[PDB]
């Protein structure tokens, strides 16, 4: 029932993601010189460094907010890819499966803690 425990849990999950080779294309904003049409397709860029900095600045109020920004990394990849068989898209699909497997208990525990506080 610790209402604050989600923040260190999210820090530790981001550490795991940064050690995974599949995260390398997504660690920093997409290079607009390498991909000059990116902003013709993608309205809101997102990357894992931006998520970690937002967390460390104290600008997420809940893990739901962090989870929305991480899911935007993956939806951007699915919208920008020219093929379902692209290398970088394949990497995002594996990394999304790993993230969803690990974020499930962080969300559950937070929502349980809030319900206990309200009881
Ligand atoms: N196939 C790709 O080039 C691509 C495919 C999916 C996501 C991307 C991609 O390139 C820029 C970074 O984000």
Task: Tell whether the torsion through CA atoms of 89, 105, 52 and 44 is positive or negative.
Answer: positive
Q: Which atom of ligand 1 is nearest to the CA of 89?
A: 6
Instruction: Say yes or no: CB of residue 77 within 6 Å of ligand 1.
Output: yes
Report how many helices (DSSP H) and strands (DSSP E) the chain contains, helices first: 5, 0
What angle, rounded to 10 degrees, do the helices at 6-19 and 63-80 form?
Answer: 30
For ligand 1, atom 13, the nearest C-alpha belongs to: 77
Please, are residues 25 and 47 in contact by the beta-carbon 8 Å criterion?
A: no
SS3 (DSSP) at 10: helix
Tell me how far the alpha carbon of residue 79 lies from the centroid of ligand 1, in angstroms.
9
CA–CA separation, 73 and 38 (whole Å): 13
CA–CA separation, 47 and 23 (whole Å): 10
Please, are residues 16 and 103 in contact by the beta-carbon 8 Å criterion?
A: no
* Phi, psi for 82 (deg, rounded to 5): -85, -10
Tokens 């937002």 belong to residue? 54
Alpha helices in the chain (DSSP H): 6-19, 38-41, 48-56, 63-80, 87-118
- Burial code (b: 16+ CB inside 10 Å, e: under 16) for 66-104 equals bbebbebbbebbeebbeeeeeeebebbeebbeebeeebe
Instruction: Say yes or no: CB of residue 15 within 6 Å of ligand 1.
Output: no
């Amino acid at each position: 029932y610790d209402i604050q425990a989600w923040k260190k849990q999210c820090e530790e999950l981001l550490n795991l993601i940064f050690q995974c080779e599949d995260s390398e294309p997504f660690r920093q904003p997409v290079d607009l010189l390498e991909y000059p049409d990116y902003r013709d397709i993608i309205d809101t860029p997102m990357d894992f460094a931006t998520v970690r900095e937002t967390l460390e600045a104290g600008n997420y109020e809940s893990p739901m907010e962090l989870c929305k920004d991480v899911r935007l990394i993956f939806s951007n990849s699915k919208a920008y890819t020219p093929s379902k068989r692209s290398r970088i898209y394949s990497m995002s699909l594996r990394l999304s499966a790993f993230f969803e497997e690990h974020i499930s208990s962080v969300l559950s525990d937070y929502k349980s803690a809030l319900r206990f506080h309200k009881r």
